[PDB]
Design a protein around this ligand. Sequence first.
Ligand SMILES: CN1CCN(Cc2ccc(NCc3ccc(F)cc3)cc2)CC1
Ligand SMILES: CN1CCN(Cc2ccc(NCc3ccc(F)cc3)cc2)CC1
Ligand SMILES: CCCCCCCCCCCCCC(=O)O
Ligand SMILES: CCCCCCCCCCCCCC(=O)O
Lengths: 177, 59, 59, 251, 251, 278, 278
Amino acid sequence: TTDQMEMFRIPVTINAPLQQQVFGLRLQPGLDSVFKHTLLGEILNYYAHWSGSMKLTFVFCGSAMATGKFLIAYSPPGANPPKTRKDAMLGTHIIWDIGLQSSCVLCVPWISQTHYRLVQQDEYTSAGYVTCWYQTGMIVPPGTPNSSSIMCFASACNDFSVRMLRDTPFISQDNKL
Amino acid sequence: GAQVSTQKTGAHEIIHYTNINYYKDAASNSANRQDFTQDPSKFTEPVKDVMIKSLPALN
Amino acid sequence: GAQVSTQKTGAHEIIHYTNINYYKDAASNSANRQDFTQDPSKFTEPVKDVMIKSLPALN
Amino acid sequence: SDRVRSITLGNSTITTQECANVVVGYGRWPTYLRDDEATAEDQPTQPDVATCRFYTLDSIKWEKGSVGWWWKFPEALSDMGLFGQNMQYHYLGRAGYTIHVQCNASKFHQGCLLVVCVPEAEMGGAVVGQAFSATAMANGDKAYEFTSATQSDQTKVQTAIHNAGMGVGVGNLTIYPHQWINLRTNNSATIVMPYINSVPMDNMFRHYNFTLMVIPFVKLDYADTASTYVPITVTVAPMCAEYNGLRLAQA
Amino acid sequence: SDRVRSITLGNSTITTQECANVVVGYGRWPTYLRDDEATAEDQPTQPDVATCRFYTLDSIKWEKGSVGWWWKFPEALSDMGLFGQNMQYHYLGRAGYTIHVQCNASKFHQGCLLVVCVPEAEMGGAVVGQAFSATAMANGDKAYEFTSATQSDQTKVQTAIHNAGMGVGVGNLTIYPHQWINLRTNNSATIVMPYINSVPMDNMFRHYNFTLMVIPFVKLDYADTASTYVPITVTVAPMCAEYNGLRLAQA
Amino acid sequence: GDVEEAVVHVADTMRSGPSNSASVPALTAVETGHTSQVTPSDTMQTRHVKNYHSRSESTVENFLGRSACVYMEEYKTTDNDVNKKFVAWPINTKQMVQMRRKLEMFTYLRFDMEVTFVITSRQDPGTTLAQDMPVLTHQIMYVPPGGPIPAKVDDYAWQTSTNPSIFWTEGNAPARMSIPFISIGNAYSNFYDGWSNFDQRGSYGYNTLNNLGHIYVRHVSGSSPHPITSTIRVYFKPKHTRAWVPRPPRLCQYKKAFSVDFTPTPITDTRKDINTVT
Amino acid sequence: GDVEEAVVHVADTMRSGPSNSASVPALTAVETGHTSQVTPSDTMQTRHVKNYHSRSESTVENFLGRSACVYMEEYKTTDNDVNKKFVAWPINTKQMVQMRRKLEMFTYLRFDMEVTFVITSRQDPGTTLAQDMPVLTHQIMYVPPGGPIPAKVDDYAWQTSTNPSIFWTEGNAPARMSIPFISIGNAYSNFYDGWSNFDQRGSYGYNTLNNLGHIYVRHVSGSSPHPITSTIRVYFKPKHTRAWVPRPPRLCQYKKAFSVDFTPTPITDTRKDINTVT
Ligand SMILES: CN1CCN(Cc2ccc(NCc3ccc(F)cc3)cc2)CC1
Ligand SMILES: CN1CCN(Cc2ccc(NCc3ccc(F)cc3)cc2)CC1
Ligand SMILES: CCCCCCCCCCCCCC(=O)O
Ligand SMILES: CCCCCCCCCCCCCC(=O)O
């Protein structure tokens, strides 16, 4: 990414090979680089334990005449992440239809063997994966751009909580200011 | 002039403590870290017209 | 908010002590080593059907 | 607005923003077997959220020359999630289905699709008086294609579209539960099909309960656009599924 | 007479004519998870008669030189009926077990067996400071044999019988739920083990809930008979099993 | 009235079953600036769960209710340089990075202060170290703005008659006290987007509003035959706190103690591709 | 309510006389896994005895309610090796054998903790020992998992703003505090028969569940002309305790701090013969 602002946009195209992956990421809100510096990851980085559900909201920023459907699925922890839409569909997922309402919300449920999870997540306290796949594909009429972008928003539900106040590792100094 | 109040504990397990103030300045009192009231509406729902979750956001 | 309870003593020989909690966290309280309830049945009689000592164990 | 519908089964949800109403079989909602109609004696298993969930089958391409496709159930879902395992390990089964078909295109596209569920869709072979294997009409979740011309190969079913492989007028399929996907005003169709059979329960590996057919009555057309095809996707979700007669697993 | 017991789970039944009483864990009967103790949010599946049934593991031979055997659960049942499939397809699980061991011999045989379930039976490797794979202690339903002498191979667990591979006196295993099979008056032992763990639920592929051990304290002996060995068989039946967190199936 | 008697829990999941209706909780519109209030019960079947977790530890009072170092400094009991034998620190909370970032998450703050002083001494290396010295004593002096400032260790200003001071002897517990809310305004301001002069000229930023005073420290009368070095650490602990207008946490490293200057930094780290999850 | 008012004895023998009946309390069957509940009154004539003995001292609370050393370590005030001037200990209870065995008699435990620190200092031998140094001061720092870790004695991380810490001066009473139940699960587990990865690979045993953090100790600012060595001892004292699933005490000697590895050991000692009693 030669341009930093490009990090916020998920590319999309017309004539997409059928059943393609849009994106894939690991669900580590406090450790993964994706969620590290978000408004939520910053808060979690001041703590050691966390619990509760999470919300992921996706907004389509294409043309008004464009249309399409997408499948977004959450895969609980396992020995292997999904590699195809057939594997992804088996877990919790929602079918998103693009229309007048430009935003859809994927609520990630709290499925864990322990009441709490470590911010410095490991194999024992892994949380799973989240992936998005083409459901029908994007179709556009003549005289429209051939590409579009999507954005994702992250936040916590009303059952979220944190614990054990620790010092964040993102900030450090070498000499007195 | 002694205040008796409950102390933090678990869900299903004399959970009382006594406090007395010795100084004439309120700034000398101990931290009042026993308040747990919160309201996220100010930042989560700053809109003018109330929107119902079930109904469509627009129209 | 002061608790008065008896202290350990012998069989035939004011056996009272006072306790007060100063901290707001129950983890700061002293050990509650005055409980003497026990039940060995969980490990000594884990059988389903109750067996009477006087009667034969089997048949 | 009544043009938005949301469906939630198990741990999966379907949201549509431009949908028509929902068709419910013959007016009968799926339900569990009653005590006064059962014949088997042993307790039935009732995997609930495990078997009852949406399962998306492979997607197809819609070109200007497409003629139609069909799927046979539950052989389509025979190898899908825990539903396939339960079918394999059990002798008897019973369940209703909810079928959702997705197809979206811009306002400058034109076309019409017929979505219909045909119970007991017995089919005849291309050469009259010559049998076909159980592969020319069902081989898993893959879709089978109709043909515009008369079929000639003896090892497969007669795929004449205008006869629908059943010796009946294709235009008379409206009698069965059905819905239309008109690109002008609709993107998806939803059908709820209860359990229909002459017996309370039946083996799901030997008997095809019903067949799903998609036929383009108005062929797709467009002009001056970068989109060359319109994908179609099918989603199905068993409802009120129960099994009986546990045994070794069918190969 | 109280020496005859019959047990019925699902579509299977166990009948014994010369059995001792039944031991029930720590006095706690298996039960479903309560609402005020659960942590997961989604609805749990509850396959009932499908998963809760007796499953007989492979049989072993008891010779005059046998030292003992052990099995680890639920890895033993990991590939047994629909129970294995449910374990494979789910992230979390929870279930109690009922263990039945069969061993019969004529009135002219003598011997004694100790049957005990050890929760969290962590074991140490033969060479201190050298790791072992997940194959020297669990490879399905096959039984693993203890050794009279000290183990020397570095790739397997220390099988010293008198230490039981846990660094503790073998004679002190009486603390755990247990039963004895004395050929004089008993042929089988029955133990009901509730779910014991530090969390409401756990993955059944990563964690061994408990270990079953059979140790002959009095070695088998006989004289002038055509029977050369006394087979031993083990039967297990999950109880009140429920799963959560459906996903793709673990290889 | 010899005695005067003086449990909030996060939300609970509610059982949800299959649904088929026109309501679409999952669909919303972020364009309104409104964060969706959907819950997992609204998009999947869920069981009934009673949750006993509490957000007690997340309150601002507990978050800011920890003592943190804000300033260190060394001064010698005896030396040729007069300025080296005592300390003079203008009070400010922007010196230490951790506490600075913790405070800068809010725009306005109002709290009482609890100050603790930790003092340690060590004997300087040299060719001759043998000596006998009784326990040392230290004086901490606070000069509100506009008051006289000492110019040497033995200055007359060390005879405080109105300025509060503390005398402390080594070997005892660290000194401690309380300070009330002493801002001329209604609340402390971590940021100030404005100037000092009315014609938009002069000092810019939060440096204009820093008028808290100074702190001075010295050895009362200790003067060893050989040099001895002492170090003092200051710890601040907000109490009875209140905050307004939260702002995003800082991302770039601090570079100045009285300015927001920074260097551009990447948003976050990178990975092989958008699909990499391993 | 200025006051709020807040004797179990072992069984008593009962008189028994001659008996002749079909009841046979002495005969039983151990095959059931049931321990006989017979008493001496059931097999011989006995007098009436009132027993006042109590099992108060045998409760788990009292059994585990004793402070025991868990870790020792030495660090120097000044030395060439940076890593030698401070300590960094991952918290665990498997280091000392006595406390390890005491804890390992139960499978699951749930208790509060009381930690006490004992610190002593001694001056290192050398060719020149004459020096004068004021009282030393020490800092104890606790870093929950994932927090920053100091790399040297004078690192920036020693400015704890959220991490709890204690500053202690020699000559006073040992430092003390309380720690609540801080396990993510519902109870501590002394044993874990499982793996870390879902495919049964990686770490094995109780090492997978040890995520308690680290403890760091240093001299605040002491730097003597000559080396001085200090030692710290950590003592743990469970309080308000509960235990489940007792297991037999260990027999073989410990050999690893994070594994159950052992060497086979004889069951017990021997004697001349089965009849020897002298
Ligand atoms: C412009 N900044 C706004 C925030 N404000 C924080 C702050 C508040 C109070 C103090 N008190 C220092 C102090 C003074 C005298 C005394 F005896 C003890 C402590 C410092 C900073 C800083 C300015
Ligand atoms: C896996 N083992 C289970 C038993 N568990 C025992 C244990 C429990 C608590 C502690 N606390 C150490 C501590 C941490 C911070 C602090 F400020 C004071 C003490 C240690 C061991 C060990 C792990
Ligand atoms: C400067 C106050 C010193 C207080 C000393 C301890 C309390 C002594 C009185 C007993 C408590 C009763 C107080 C009250 O009447 O509210
Ligand atoms: C922080 C608490 C300090 C308590 C000081 C000693 C007790 C003084 C009050 C006399 C006892 C009465 C207590 C009560 O009302 O329960």
